[PDB]
Amino acid sequence: GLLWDLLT
Amino acid sequence: CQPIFLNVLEAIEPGVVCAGHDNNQPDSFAALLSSLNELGERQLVHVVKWAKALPGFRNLHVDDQMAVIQYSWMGLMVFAMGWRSFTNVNSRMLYFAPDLVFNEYRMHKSRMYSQCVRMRHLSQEFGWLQITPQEFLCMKALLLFSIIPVDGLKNQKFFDELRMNYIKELDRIIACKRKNPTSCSRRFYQLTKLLDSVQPIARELHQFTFDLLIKSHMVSVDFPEMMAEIISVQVPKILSGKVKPIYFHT
Ligand SMILES: C[C@]12CCC(=O)C[C@@H]1CC[C@@H]1[C@@H]2CC[C@]2(C)[C@@H](O)CC[C@@H]12
């Protein structure tokens, strides 16, 4: 998700 | 001796975030909640950038880094909103953002008046307890590590260590100008009670947003991508009791 991308 | 930990928390504290709400239009449930949702999406971006810069956060398994953010965002954001409301308008209104300030009329129009008054009460506590900016920063950081799953995190041990260290830092902040162990104990009692008070509020909001997401299409409320994913996947784990807050008191 966009959150995962944001986190990584 | 420089306060390294506190220096870091102050340095990474997010700046002002606006909701993009049109305050020239008459208030409406759909517009108000759509703006709150957009503000949530915008703040989530800042919370992730902030969390990743917290001392020791990277020690957590990446899957756990994700989890803690997904479960604690509501509490984190409500706590910060309460602080803004206190500092900016002395709790007279809920300061969600410079362009999204809730007066009683908006609290009613939002259909979450009960939750709003509880958040206003939280805001008032910052003043009644004379919470310092530094106590606020440490407590907010601790809120990121205050809700975990029953099946445990990928590496529960690293999380437990990090949480313990943040509690330790809160102790240090309390003992700063306090040379009396009893005064420190009384302050710790006050702050842990305040921290605990955030959870029931966050739960009520979790329930409200979940219900709103389920019927969003018929009430014309828009949910941004990340918010919709988190509220449909992570929030229900909290509501179904699979993920629970860590309360200091019982
Ligand atoms: C976290 C936010 C937005 C950021 C903030 O300042 C606190 C506030 C608390 C109420 C939340 C809102 C985001 C959108 C939600 C979750 C709505 O769907 C219903 C409750 C709202």
Side-chain angles (χ1 to χ4, degrees):
Chain A
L2 297 179
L3 183 64
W4 172 269
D5 289 52
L6 211 178
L7 179 57
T8 60
Chain B
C1 180
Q2 285 288 298
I4 301 298
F5 181 75
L6 272 179
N7 276 357
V8 179
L9 296 194
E10 180 176 359
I12 65 175
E13 181 67 353
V16 176
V17 180
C18 297
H21 184 69
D22 182 352
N23 287 289
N24 297 283
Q25 292 297 321
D27 296 316
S28 78
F29 174 70
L32 290 172
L33 270 294
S34 290
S35 284
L36 282 171
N37 284 343
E38 176 59 29
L39 177 64
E41 187 89 346
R42 298 180 175 190
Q43 290 197 186
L44 186 54
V45 173
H46 285 82
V47 170
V48 175
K49 302 165 68 175
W50 166 77
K52 297 197 302 174
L54 281 165
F57 189 76
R58 291 176 62 70
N59 290 324
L60 299 179
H61 182 294
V62 67
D63 281 26
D64 296 340
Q65 288 179 38
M66 192 83 151
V68 292
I69 292 173
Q70 290 171 153
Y71 299 133
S72 72
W73 63 274
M74 185 72 78
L76 287 165
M77 298 180 183
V78 167
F79 193 68
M81 187 278 293
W83 175 251
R84 288 196 293 281
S85 298
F86 167 62
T87 65
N88 304 325
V89 297
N90 188 39
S91 307
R92 180 183 52 176
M93 297 180 277
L94 294 184
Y95 199 102
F96 290 107
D99 63 335
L100 191 58
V101 180
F102 271 38
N103 45 30
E104 287 259 321
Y105 184 67
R106 284 181 166 177
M107 292 179 204
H108 174 88
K109 181 64 65 181
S110 73
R111 300 181 190 177
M112 39 179 260
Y113 182 88
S114 60
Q115 300 90 328
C116 282
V117 181
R118 294 195 59 174
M119 289 190 279
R120 193 214 67 208
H121 189 287
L122 176 63
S123 178
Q124 290 181 293
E125 286 277 43
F126 282 111
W128 297 333
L129 294 173
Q130 297 179 202
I131 299 296
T132 73
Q134 295 66 47
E135 290 173 324
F136 163 71
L137 292 175
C138 197
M139 285 187 278
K140 185 158 59 61
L142 186 52
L143 278 176
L144 173 64
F145 312 113
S146 299
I147 178 167
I148 61 179
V150 295
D151 294 309
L153 295 167
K154 263 62 177 183
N155 196 307
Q156 188 67 51
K157 295 177 177 177
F158 292 154
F159 169 95
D160 295 336
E161 171 188 54
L162 193 58
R163 178 179 162 83
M164 172 179 75
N165 285 308
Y166 275 73
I167 292 174
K168 179 183 301 178
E169 290 306 317
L170 184 61
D171 287 322
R172 295 183 182 179
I173 295 175
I174 291 177
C176 179
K177 239 60 182 177
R178 297 190 178 74
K179 200 63 173 299
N180 181 300
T182 294
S183 68
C184 292
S185 297
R186 302 179 71 162
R187 188 54 170 180
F188 190 72
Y189 177 78
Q190 294 179 305
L191 304 191
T192 51
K193 274 293 179 178
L194 185 62
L195 282 169
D196 280 354
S197 78
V198 175
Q199 301 304 331
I201 296 177
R203 184 178 175 72
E204 283 192 58
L205 293 172
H206 279 143
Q207 187 63 63
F208 186 89
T209 194
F210 170 77
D211 292 336
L212 184 54
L213 177 63
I214 295 301
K215 69 186 181 188
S216 64
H217 56 298
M218 51 183 71
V219 293
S220 300
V221 171
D222 295 316
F223 279 80
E225 192 183 307
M226 294 192 291
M227 289 286 283
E229 187 186 305
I230 292 175
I231 299 172
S232 66
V233 182
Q234 311 310 323
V235 174
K237 293 192 179 67
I238 297 173
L239 298 179
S240 66
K242 296 169 71 173
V243 175
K244 306 185 296 183
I246 297 172
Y247 285 94
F248 280 98
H249 305 272
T250 312

